Automatic annotation (TrEMBL), chains A, D:
This is CRISPR-associated protein. It comes from the Bacteria.
Automatic annotation (TrEMBL), chain B:
It comes from Nostoc sp. 'Peltigera membranacea cyanobiont' 210A. This is Type I-MYXAN CRISPR-associated protein Cas5/Cmx5/DevS.
TrEMBL record, chain C:
This is Type I-MYXAN CRISPR-associated Cas8a1/Cmx1. The lineage of its organism: Bacteria, Bacillati, Cyanobacteriota, Cyanophyceae, Nostocales. It comes from the Bacteria.
Length: 285, 212, 494, 285
């Protein structure tokens, strides 16, 4: 009996220059690409969020094969023969080699800035009477919210109890690799759309969408609501939590809409407790 | 002749890096038949690759996606030591955004029962019965699929961009991928033709076979 | 006789690089039959039958000697050490372009010294405008291209191999082994004929130098190399196109964008109004990752599809907008590329309006007026394209309105001017620019604009288009209206 | 455990021109960008506040690897090799010389303007009839309260006692890089929202909002209060002090809201003393 847990999570509003890409002498370009309507949005690589989860798992017990030496800023590997039955990271994120391999039990898309990117940069000349090179750096930044989508096959896990630490990690995501010195951007969720179903396909990949450039309302996308009303994407398996709950409860006719009978909580921790109880009951933990 | 099964695909981010583009993550405009075949095998939970040879696949591309480049510190097997900095290399990889396409599956050429079309159908009527692992993805493992559902020819009732394999076309899509090197990889030359049809042209049918 | 080597563009397994290598084969064999028309002149008696899209090979005896002769004749090195590819017409190519192509090919194909042995650095002082700039380049002695015949043919039988041959990145650009520890197994493999095509690819593709607009060209000599690889539709068409593009000057090859180099590759193509013109090419960017990078790495690949409209618009831009300034200093032939041309070209390729944001680039970004001067030199051209822009219409009417208002103000000043004294019209214009630039918000700028329009007097244009101009003033952001007012001041011509 | 300190700080009201970007023509533009509601706001960079903290640590008498010669206006290094064990600035702010690098405990974000920037400018001109090209000039200024977000990792500090001087410096921040001659803008805090928790998730980033688009009112944001109501962000881990305390105490039903059972102090020094006592108790100092 396969069981999955998909989720679309939207972060807060803040100033971010997280991932970046190769510089051009001047400027540290935040990487970006096209999105809905062709407007350019700033991205955050999937490997970034996977690295953040690995760091979370390492920071709180939860034995990790791929330990990150903070002092040396390098990745040391404890046991060259990966053992998913023991190491959490090989159980979840998998591994690769020249047994032979193990597909990661976690797959997440790259994070997307909810609002299109406008040309924004930060001057960076370093203090000092002497003005030599390596001064006047430019840091392209973005004042938006980041929304990313993940999916885990809990069945593929070697230890079925490892789903819960991933839930705590995604809720308390420590840090996506970024200019924390200049732009400390928290990545904790502000509005969640979770679904725990035995179906392989979940049509909730990117449901937070507002556009409306330079704004933070972050309404639920119309297409997601239409899909919910259609009959598919069963509301009983839906879990809606965060600040979007307020806007949902301020929607007209919401008391009679099919979205009403979905698990809905303003408090994020109550959502997490209820979902974890359901998952533990279904998986027999 | 039983109507071929039709699937609606919607992937937010995807990439089909080409065989010979090993220095760069530069991708095909259209999902290759090999990647689609592998993803269908993953959906039906078929680990063996030789089980469903002969199935004919046709791809209808609903909207032309945008091509964007992203940076990644991809890891490679250059030095014996894992912690050696020679393993990590910064390079660019192209992605395709907001990919919506329709897939036609014709498993009549299969010689082993049940065929792939029957397996996909039975998977969609009873999702709980099918036993598999992993999370369904197109291209790279982290590129999940937003929506894969059973759909008709009229789901968008719009205009379709088909992938017709033209001997004088531009795209060189592989229908069988040899992951180790390039010996067994087999290529076919395609083109994107804008036609208003709800059914794929014969030429658009790409039939997967073993390289032998 | 029967073909020991058969090659057709219609083959399904071929890629773009295989097709361009096929074109290289076609042109080098054309130049060979120009040089050796008679059968017995060529060693091994290798005959070639050439069609529009097929190249056909027969020879006599063992293959090894035939392909050895073919390879040795195909790739050569002159006394100066520069590359000598018989496919390209070196006779009418000057030494500067020869240095350009040789430097490009060692910088993209022969990036690794494991494949080539270099000679001594040869410096020559070529004379331009009574300036002997010393061109310094590294001469070559041998490279793997001259001796790939050993790998192509079997060692024991001296014949072509009947199995796949492992290739490397120097043959196929981008085909590096990702995992070095698996070098023996995970290596790209190809048939011998496609390997020959990958041998002969370099002749077709041209090479351009990229200049970063942010980087001062004085403080940074160009080192990024753009490789333009064209999609092949016909052997003869590609050969004629390459031979035509041979005519261009090296200073043209120095570009500021990948699209600029792609358009330059198709700049000399003939335009036929009955024939629907459509050409596609790939631009491969090679750039050192860091300052101390030993060899270049593939940093960008971008597809360019040029239709009739895009190409004629690019020719129009080339005509109206100024060319590169060939600054020449102590062995320093710098080239000043007009950013605007590239900006337009980029937008054209994007398919978006050329006037995406010229002013931003010309003034806002270009405080130095590097391209703003080009604006001054090509302001008419800017207006020309703007004229093409229908949406501009309303702003054109506003331009005429402001010009009429300033005409009225200048008439008032002329009336105020005393006899004999010289009216300060230049000083008044400078005051107008300063006052407009001083305006800091919507309210103050609109105050000044309305007051100036009132002081201008009776305006015919503002009367004819009353509602349209009124709504344009009410709706448009004040920064935009200020920008177009500045353009009106700059475009005033009695 | 893993304790962290997060806070959003609001400054007093005054005229500020602290972050002039690359000037155009004769006008010295102060750096600005978009923010809430799509209105342009003036930004003061986080590097400026990091420099101010470095200067505070230098002045108070702590080691500080980077010495700033005020008279020479130059920066000198006490030792070419960074030693985070011995130097406070190397411990906190990190380093990268190009071991070699440190992550850095202090992670700070930009200082946004609470009120949108209208575009007010000031003309300055050299006196005397003798006038040259440098005679007259325009300087852009803004009358606003500034708000920035910072986050530090107590565990990441090589010496845990170093958290006290950084807090003292934040509450006694020296001049932030600007134009003190003609716009002397004090950056001293006047309203704090501090969180000292073991979880990472932070919901106090930019929790301040204006009552009127052009006013010095500085009320607490609705989202922060609502999130405290809903159940997350435990009031026991909340620390609010400053001028916003009066507005919070004048709110209706305040004695019943969860805001009541949170650490609130009118005097900022008392709240700082209490938080410092809590930190010293938690980290064994």
């Amino acid at each position: 009996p396969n069981y999955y847990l998909y989720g679309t999570v939207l972060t807060r509003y803040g100033l971010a220059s997280l991932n970046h890409d190769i510089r051009r002498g001047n400027k540290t370009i935040l990487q970006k690409g096209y999105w809905n309507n062709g407007k350019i949005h700033s991205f955050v690589g999937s490997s970034a969020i996977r690295w953040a989860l690995r760091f979370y798992l390492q920071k709180q017990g939860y034995l990790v094969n791929r330990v990150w030496d903070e002092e040396e800023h390098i990745n040391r590997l404890t046991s060259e023969d990966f053992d998913p039955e023991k190491f959490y990271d090989d159980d979840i994120f998998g591994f690769a080699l020249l047994p032979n391999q193990r597909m990661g039990a976690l797959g997440m898309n790259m994070a997307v800035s909810l609002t299109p990117y406008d040309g924004a940069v930060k001057l960076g000349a370093k203090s000092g009477r002497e003005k030599d090179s390596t001064s006047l750096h430019f840091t392209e930044y973005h004042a938006t919210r980041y929304q990313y989508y993940f999916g885990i096959d809990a069945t593929h896990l070697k230890d079925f109890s490892r789903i819960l630490p991933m839930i705590d990690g995604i809720m308390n995501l420590p840090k996506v690799g970024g200019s924390s010195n200049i732009f400390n951007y928290p990545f904790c969720p502000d509005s969640l759309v979770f679904q725990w179903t035995n179906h392989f396909a979940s049509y909730i990949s990117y449901c937070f969408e507002y556009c409306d450039p330079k704004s933070k309302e972050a309404k639920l996308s119309q297409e997601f609501i239409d899909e919910v009303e259609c009959g598919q994407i069963d509301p009983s398996k839906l879990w809606i939590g965060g600040t979007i709950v307020k806007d949902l409860q301020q929607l007209d006719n919401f008391e009679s809409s099919p979205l009403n009978k979905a698990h809905i909580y303003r408090n994020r921790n109550e959502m997490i407790e209820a979902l974890k109880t359901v998952i533990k009951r279904d998986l027999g933990l | 002749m039983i109507a071929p099964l039709i699937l609606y695909l919607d992937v937010p981010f995807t990439t089909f890096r080409e065989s010979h583009a090993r220095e760069m993550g530069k991708t095909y405009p259209v999902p290759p038949p090999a990647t689609v075949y592998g993803m269908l095998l993953s959906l039906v939970g078929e680990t063996n690759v030789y089980r469903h040879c002969g199935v004919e696949l046709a791809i209808a591309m609903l909207s032309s996606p945008k091509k964007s480049r992203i940076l990644r510190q991809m890891r490679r097997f250059k030095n014996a030591d894992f912690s050696h900095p020679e393993n990590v290399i910064p390079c660019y990889q192209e992605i395709l955004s907001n990919l919506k396409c329709l897939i036609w599956v014709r498993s009549d050429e299969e010689k082993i029962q049940p065929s792939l079309r029957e397996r996909i159908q039975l998977a969609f009527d009873h999702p709980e019965l099918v036993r598999r692992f992993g999370c369904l993805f197109l291209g790279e493992s982290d590129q999940l699929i937003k929506t894969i559902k059973l759909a008709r020819e009229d789901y968008l009732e719009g205009v379709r961009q088909w992938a017709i394999r033209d001997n004088r076309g531009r795209l060189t899509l592989p229908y069988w991928v040899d992951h180790v090197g390039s010996r067994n990889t087999r290529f076919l030359r395609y083109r994107i033709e804008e036609m208003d049809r709800l059914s794929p042209p014969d030429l658009a049918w790409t039939m997967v076979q073993s390289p032998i | 006789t029967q073909p020991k080597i058969s090659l057709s563009l219609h083959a399904a397994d071929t890629t773009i690089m295989h097709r361009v290598g096929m074109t290289g084969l076609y042109m080098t064999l054309k130049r060979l039959e120009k040089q050796y028309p008679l059968s017995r002149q060529r060693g091994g008696h290798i005959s070639w039958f050439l069609t529009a899209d097929t190249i056909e090979l027969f020879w006599e005896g063992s293959d090894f000697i035939a392909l050895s002769w073919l390879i040795n004749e195909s790739f050569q090195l002159d006394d100066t050490g520069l590359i000598h590819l018989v496919g390209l017409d070196n006779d009418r190519i000057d030494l500067r372009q020869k240095i350009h192509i040789h430097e490009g090919i060692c910088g993209v194909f022969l990036r690794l010294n494991k494949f080539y042995q270099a000679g001594e650095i040869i410096n020559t002082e070529l004379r331009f405008e009574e300036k002997q700039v010393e061109y310094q380049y590294k001469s070559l002695t041998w490279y793997a291209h001259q001796t790939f015949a050993e790998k192509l043919c079997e060692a024991d039988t001296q014949q072509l191999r009947h199995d796949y041959i492992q290739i490397t990145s120097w043959l196929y650009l981008g085909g590096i082994v990702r995992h070095a520890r698996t070098q023996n197994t995970t290596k790209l493999e190809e048939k011998p004929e496609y390997a020959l095509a990958l041998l002969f690819v370099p002749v077709v593709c041209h090479y351009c130098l990229l200049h970063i607009p942010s980087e001062d060209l004085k403080e940074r000599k160009p080192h990024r190399y753009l490789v333009v690889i064209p999609e092949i539709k016909d052997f003869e068409d590609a050969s004629q196109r390459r031979w035509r593009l041979q005519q261009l000057e090296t200073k043209q090859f120095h570009v500021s964008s990948l699209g600029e180099a792609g358009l330059l590759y198709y700049s000399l193509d003939d335009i036929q109004p009955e024939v629907a013109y459509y050409q596609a090419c790939q631009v491969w960017l090679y750039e050192k990752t860091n300052k101390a990078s030993r060899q270049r790495t593939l940093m960008s690949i971008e597809e360019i599809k040029i239709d009739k409209n895009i190409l004629i618009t690019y020719q129009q831009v080339q005509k109206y907008f100024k060319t590169n300034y060939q600054i020449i200093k102590y062995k320093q032939i710098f080239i000043k590329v007009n950013p605007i041309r590239s900006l337009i070209a980029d937008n054209l390729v994007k398919g978006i309006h050329w006037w995406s944001n010229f002013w931003e680039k010309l003034v806002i970004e270009d405080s130095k007026e590097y391209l703003f001067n080009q604006l001054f030199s090509n302001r008419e051209g800017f207006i020309i394209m703007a004229e093409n822009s229908e949406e501009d219409k309303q702003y054109l009417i506003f331009i005429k309105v402001f010009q009429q208002a300033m005409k009225g103000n200048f008439a008032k000043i002329y009336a105020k001017t005393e006899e004999g004294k010289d009216p300060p019209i230049k000083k008044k214009v400078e005051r107008l620019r300063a006052e407009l630039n001083y305006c800091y918000d919507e309210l103050s700028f609109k105050e000044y604009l309305s007051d100036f329009l009132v002081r201008g007097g009776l305006n015919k244009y503002f009367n004819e288009h009353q509602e349209e101009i009124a709504l344009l003033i009410k709706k448009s952001p004040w920064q935009e209206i200020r920008i177009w007012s500045l353009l009106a001041i700059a475009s005033y011509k009695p």
